[PDB]
Write a protein that holds these residues in place. Structure first.
Motif, short mmCIF file in Angstrom:
data_model
loop_
_atom_site.label_atom_id
_atom_site.label_comp_id
_atom_site.label_asym_id
_atom_site.label_seq_id
_atom_site.Cartn_x
_atom_site.Cartn_y
_atom_site.Cartn_z
N UNK A 175 0.86 -1.18 0.00
CA UNK A 175 0.00 0.00 0.00
C UNK A 175 0.89 1.23 0.00
N UNK A 176 0.60 2.18 -0.88
CA UNK A 176 1.36 3.42 -0.99
C UNK A 176 0.59 4.54 -0.31
N UNK A 177 1.22 5.18 0.68
CA UNK A 177 0.61 6.29 1.40
C UNK A 177 1.57 7.47 1.41
N UNK A 178 2.43 7.55 0.41
CA UNK A 178 3.45 8.59 0.32
C UNK A 178 3.07 9.67 -0.67
N UNK A 179 4.08 10.20 -1.35
CA UNK A 179 3.91 11.27 -2.33
C UNK A 179 4.97 11.08 -3.41
N UNK A 180 5.24 12.15 -4.17
CA UNK A 180 6.25 12.07 -5.23
C UNK A 180 7.57 11.52 -4.70
N UNK A 181 7.99 11.96 -3.51
CA UNK A 181 9.09 11.35 -2.79
C UNK A 181 8.49 10.46 -1.70
#
Lengths: 439, 435
Positions: free
Chosen positions: B413-419
């Protein structure tokens, strides 16, 4: 592990005086002519005092064989404390001992008119108390490597004898230390100046001086045992009495030798000149002028609290550790008579004692103090009085009567001073008591 | 923590003095056997020599202290988590069949298959923490000689030699529990609920109380939740089995009432269900609500060992306590944190570890413990490495033939941003068997 010595002479701890071996061989009518006929005198003169270490000696017939030890003897000795008769029971519980003494009172006059309002008044008894504390805790440690000790013996009988020798040496050490500790009590008691001193000139100087000392001791012993009592022979200045059978005189060996050689042998009816009380002999006192000490049986306050033995075994080193723990109380009572019998130059006044040492006075109360001066001469002395309370309104008169101001609260010390020195060189002997203020 | 001679009197079946020591050890004809008023005789007999004194004192301290301390450590308030000796062959694993629906009666459907198995038991392993320590204390010969004056001195001496060790152990138990809770939170298997500084304001306090009541009511749902717990296995809990571990400051700020009314209990039965500790030392953890069977402790052994120093004339007695602490992976455990926790805490794969043939397929589903209602997408990766072995985007994994390695399915699961220096993943072991 193989200890070996080599190249040692049989003259190690030897400081020759005249070389008897050489002195014998050159004599012309000298005292050594008796040893001239002796054939094997040189060997006896060489090894007649024993040797400290022995070497392997080959047999004189067959050099391969070696001479062997033919006799093994183990010396044993037992030591005792001659003062052990002055001991008392055990006190397993507690570290202190309390001693209480009550004194005499003063007579009043019958007065029926004044007895109708002072019926409920109270007179307080004179009671004094002292304390003694435990003051000796020590132990003796010895190790025994029995497993490695077996190579020094070839018979089982000597092994236990040798180990029991060490076991007994432990108790011998304990006895010696106990004797020294008991003698230290007398020595330091004289050092503190609490003894009542009687001035003699010198015992081992002349027969006249010796018999004068005998007369003085007889008079002192008689004076101690009067039925009505006296206050001149105890440091607490209480009126007490002693019995003849309870009086012990401690002296040294030279004194009894001089006594019995000089004045006892040449005395018809010798019971009129010998000592009165029970006479004990020691190896002299550490003090300088002390010659003989006359004390009461109750004077000694020695007790024993602990006497235990513990053993530990080391399975790695194969040896035993033995610990002997001894705990004791060493003290002397100040309520018993004691006489010093000193021979050297002594001060005119030894000490001064205020009879009430502990006082408990209210703010506006009054107290009475009496001073006893222990003097070594027939001359009298005068006592001055002072107070170091710190506050104003309290003071003591010339007769020792105290008045205390209400507005004060601190410790008060009452000091009585006697001057024994000459002018321009003052010399004061002082005695003090502690007074506690009660609200 | 304040145990006296009454405690040992109740623990044992005796009153006042006892002669069991000289009955069980010669030593018999060394001390009087009477229980009368005489104490000088028994004191002299005990202190008559070092061997007898040491034997008596050793037997007394060892046996009596062991019995008393073992009896009294099982009556402390945190006794419901305490069990007896560890059972043999525990296998350090927990097995729990998942509760499912019931199949509808159908003779035509049933006649085709009758020997078919139903489902695996989806078991896992225990989370363990062992403890072994000692305290040790000294007693002197002087305060053994001065203990036979009266029959009260002896019992005072016994209480003095027991109480210090007992209270030290009782204090240390709470610390070990706190460390276990901290380690579990550091692992992160707690299910998280966001709050905002209950002690900051009165509104924060009532918000926290309302959130606690709602969480308790959701946990005690009769039909089962599956939302809580370390792994989604559909367990249900009861109201009286919920235990609360709360910070000292928060407990002091909160009143005894209303907090109990949030549950179905009233103060008297709530003080026995609430446990208060001083600080958590873990970020912003405030209060942890766990199931009754969540935490367990098994006492491996308790022992007393004594040794005498004769150079110093004293004794040293050591109390060794060894025990293990375990936490279940199937019990409910809510963290109730207040801070900057990420939106997604962890993704959990339901199949966990599985076994498949060389030409089969397996369905994997995932549960995401998200702190916000915003939905998060899950991507399936096969890891492994082969030709024809892959998992689609719906969680269906197909195993190709001629395969010999073991693969690990992962859900990300991705809960980040561009970085994006953050990645929450869940691992699932699949073991292949030859066909």
């Amino acid at each position: 592990m193989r200890i070996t010595f080599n190249d040692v002479k049989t003259s190690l701890g030897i400081t020759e005086s005249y070389d008897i071996v050489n002195a014998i061989r050159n004599s012309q009518g000298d005292n050594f002519k008796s040893y001239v006929p002796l054939a094997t005198a040189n060997n006896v003169a060489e090894v007649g005092a024993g040797i400290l270490i022995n070497q392997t000696v080959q047999n004189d017939f067959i050099t391969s064989l070696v001479d062997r030890i033919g006799l093994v003897v183990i010396r044993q000795v037992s030591l005792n404390n001659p003062l052990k008769k002055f001991k008392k029971g055990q006190i397993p519980l507690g570290r202190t001992i309390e001693e209480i003494y009550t004194d005499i009172t003063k007579e009043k006059q019958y007065d029926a008119e004044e007895a109708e309002q002072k019926v409920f008044e109270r007179e307080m008894p004179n009671v004094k108390t002292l304390f003694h504390e435990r003051n000796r805790q020590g132990f003796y440690h010895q190790t025994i490597q029995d497993d490695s000790l077996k190579t020094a013996f070839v018979s089982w009988g000597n092994f236990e004898s040798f180990v029991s020798s060490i076991i007994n040496a432990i108790y011998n050490s304990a006895e010696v230390d106990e004797y020294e500790y008991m003698k230290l009590l007398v020595d330091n008691y004289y050092s503190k100046g609490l003894f009542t001193t009687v001035k003699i000139d010198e015992p081992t100087s002349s027969t006249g001086a010796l018999t004068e000392f005998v007369k003085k001791m007889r008079a002192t012993a008689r004076k101690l045992t009067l039925p009505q009592g006296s206050r001149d022979w105890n440091s607490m200045a209480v009126r007490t009495r002693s019995y003849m059978e309870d009086l012990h005189l401690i002296i040294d060996a030279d004194l009894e030798a001089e006594l019995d050689v000089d004045v006892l042998a040449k005395a018809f009816n010798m019971n009129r000149t010998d000592f009165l009380g029970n006479v004990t002999v020691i190896d002299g006192f550490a003090s300088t002028g002390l010659e003989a000490v006359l004390v009461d049986k109750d004077w000694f306050m020695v007790y024993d609290n602990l006497h235990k033995m513990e053993t530990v075994r080391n399975p790695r080193g194969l040896y035993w550790n033995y610990y002997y723990h001894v705990w004791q109380t060493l003290s002397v009572s100040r309520f018993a008579n004691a006489v010093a019998f000193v021979s050297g130059d002594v001060p005119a006044v030894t000490q001064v004692i205020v009879s009430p040492n502990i006082a408990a006075v209210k703010q506006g109360g009054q107290q009475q103090f009496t001073a006893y001066v222990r003097a070594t001469n027939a001359k009298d002395h005068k006592v001055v009085w002072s107070v170091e309370g710190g506050s104003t309104g309290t003071a003591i008169t010339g007769d020792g009567l105290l008045s205390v101001s209400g507005n004060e609260d601190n410790q008060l010390t009452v000091k009585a001073t006697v001057d024994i020195g000459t002018e321009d060189k003052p010399k004061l002997v002082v005695g003090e008591a502690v007074v506690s203020i009660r609200p």
